[PDB]
């Protein structure tokens, strides 16, 4: 919708987290999009549990990769608990949802953005935080510590992150993304990746698989 967005400024984004040594980026990004839509709908910003999804999403593989849609679908079906009540342990344990406290923040649906298209992605970010995919394998993404990432990445996505805003700074458009590698990476745990570029799969394949929780 507008020339710029930043959900952190509107108070819809929680602190940058650490996945640690576990392949749970899918769980991290989906929680960030849900904390985002809850605050948007509810006015309440609370941290939710990536651990519950890690142990509880049975379509995904805990600390060995998982899905955007299946974790988003888990919350739509069962709701999700508070982070403080179901602590992150960086290892897949037995599902504690029923023992922890049965459903807390719940959504009712899950949407996937029309793929390979700048316009649709911005329209979705304009409404709330979106779960996006990016190729993080490279050394430039890896040792990134600041500015608008033009790249040196291909499109072989391998990481789910959270698109929290977009804008233009110095002539260039960008997508503001919340990464889960702690505050010691990029711009305090964040990365501005250059946007679009003639190729619709996007920079570092950021236009490939974008999902958002739907709260009716």
Write down the catalytic residue from 56, 81, 153, 179. Answer: 179
Write down the catalytic residue from 22, 25, 63, 153. Answer: 25
188 is catalytic: no
199 is catalytic: no
DSSP-derived secondary structure for 117-180: -HHHHHHHHTTS-EEEEE---SHHHHT--SSEE--S--S---EEEEEEEEEEETTEEEEEEE-S
User: Which helix (H) or strand (E) segment is 99 a member of?
Assistant: helix 97-100
Structural tokens at position 159:
């990481």
Write down the catalytic residue from 81, 153, 159, 204. Answer: 159
204 is catalytic: no
| Residue 202 and residue 196 in contact, taking contact as beta carbons nearer than 8 Å | yes
| Residues carrying an active site annotation | 25, 159, 179
């Amino acid at each position: 919708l507008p020339e710029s967005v930043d959900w952190r400024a509107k108070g819809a984004v929680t602190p940058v987290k650490h996945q640690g040594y576990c392949e749970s980026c899918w769980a991290f990004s989906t929680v960030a999009t849900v904390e985002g839509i809850n605050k948007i709908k509810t006015g309440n910003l609370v941290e939710l549990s990536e651990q519950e999804l890690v142990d509880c999403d049975l379509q995904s593989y805990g600390c060995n990769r998982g899905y955007q849609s299946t974790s988003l679908q888990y919350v739509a079906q069962n709701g999700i608990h508070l982070r403080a009540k179901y602590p992150y342990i960086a290892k897949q344990q037995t599902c504690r949802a029923n023992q922890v406290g049965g459903p807390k923040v719940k959504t009712n649906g899950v949407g996937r953005v029309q793929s390979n298209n700048e316009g649709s992605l911005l329209n979705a970010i304009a409404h709330q935080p979106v779960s996006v995919v990016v190729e993080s394998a490279g050394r430039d993404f890896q040792n990134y510590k600041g500015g608008i990432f033009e790249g040196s990445c291909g499109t072989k996505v391998d990481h789910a992150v959270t698109a929290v805003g977009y804008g233009k700074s110095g002539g260039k458009g960008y997508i503001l993304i919340k990464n889960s590698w702690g505050p010691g990476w990029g711009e305090n745990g964040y990365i501005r990746i250059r946007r679009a570029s003639g190729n619709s799969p996007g920079v570092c394949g950021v236009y490939r698989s974008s999902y958002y929780p739907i709260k009716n």
